[PDB]
Design a protein around this ligand. Structure first.
Ligand SMILES: C[N+](C)(C)CCOP(=O)(O)O
Ligand SMILES: [Ca+2]
Ligand SMILES: [Ca+2]
Ligand SMILES: [Fe+3]
Ligand SMILES: [Fe+3]
Length: 305
């Protein structure tokens, strides 16, 4: 305690984050996995853009880091949303580690208004529910007020955008993409604050709404890897006013190519920005101290090699 490990991608964008406090371990998201549905089960039909590439898989880096840390137990796994590059390794983790619970908001294909954004989502969701039932791992889907503040080693954690919002009948409210449903975590320890918002976007107003409620932080994980079209809205960055942005991506901020204007804007504001992308190390690690964040990535063994 107290450290945050952002598992590095080889290529593309994917989130797996390990929180380490005192001697406790937890995960915020789990990264993309080898498995995917092929359409042999019509519940999970093939659809175009389901991820298949081993170059985008984080499975081996996640499991190697956990083993290198002598993890015996995860106190929780928090899942931000159902996309495979976030929920992907949950059932593999549930099958390997003791886990005391999982935070997983409700999902249904029916609540996504675009058929071309269903992909893999349900397969991943249903892997969590089925595997957690087989292992007796408690799944918190109806997160009370609640529930949404709580204590993890030395870390104080506050959740946002955690409710299952319903229509009448209710039925989950319709959204354009599961990104807008992203479960947000703010972690506070040693006088520092870290925002972790999955693939939060502003398509249904979530950045406009939660920016002012979250307020000032020190370290911000970029929303949705690198996108500046529908995420990482300037009002949202100014609300959080982070000293450091970490991207779980090998790409610079991106809107029809490198958003050089946006990259320049961050430098002008004095915001440092780093990519958690590597061929040499499993994670970009910060030590979270009273004095600031120290990048201790090179203090771990490299990937063999
Ligand atoms: C689910 N997916 C991996 C096929 C699409 C990409 O997800 P996103 O990171 O752009 O929301
Ligand atoms: Ca997968
Ligand atoms: Ca899996
Ligand atoms: Fe993603
Ligand atoms: Fe996503």
């Amino acid at each position: 305690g107290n450290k945050i490990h952002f598992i590095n991608v080889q290529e593309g964008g994917s989130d797996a984050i390990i929180l380490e406090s005192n001697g406790h371990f937890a995960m915020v998201d789990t990264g993309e996995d080898y498995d995917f549905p092929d359409g042999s089960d019509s519940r999970y039909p093939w659809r175009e853009g389901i991820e298949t590439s081993y170059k985008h898989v984080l499975t081996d880096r996640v499991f190697r880091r956990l083993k290198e840390l002598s993890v015996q137990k995860l106190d929780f796994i928090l899942v931000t949303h159902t996309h495979s590059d976030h929920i992907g390794n949950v059932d593999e983790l549930l099958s390997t580690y003791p886990v005391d619970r999982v935070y997983l908001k409700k999902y249904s294909d029916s609540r996504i208004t675009n058929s071309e954004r269903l992909w893999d989502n349900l397969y991943g969701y249903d892997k969590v529910l089925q595997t957690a039932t087989e292992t007796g791992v408690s799944v918190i889907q109806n997160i009370t007020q609640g529930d949404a503040h709580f204590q993890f080693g030395d870390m104080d954690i506050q959740l946002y955008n955690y409710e299952n919002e319903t229509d009448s009948s209710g039925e989950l409210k319709k959204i354009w993409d599961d990104n807008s449903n992203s479960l947000i975590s703010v972690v506070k320890v040693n006088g520092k604050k870290i925002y972790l918002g999955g693939d939060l976007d502003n398509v249904h107003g979530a950045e406009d709404k939660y920016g002012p409620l979250i307020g000032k932080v020190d370290l911000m994980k970029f929303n949705h890897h690198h996108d500046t079209n529908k995420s990482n809205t300037k009002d949202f960055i100014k609300n959080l006013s982070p000293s450091l942005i970490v991207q779980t991506s090998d790409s610079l901020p991106w809107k029809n190519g490198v958003d050089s204007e946006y990259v320049n804007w961050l430098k002008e504001r004095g915001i440092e920005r780093i990519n958690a992308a590597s061929k040499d190390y499993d994670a970009t690690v910060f030590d979270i101290r009273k004095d600031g964040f120290v990048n201790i990535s090179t203090s771990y063994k490299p990937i063999p090699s």
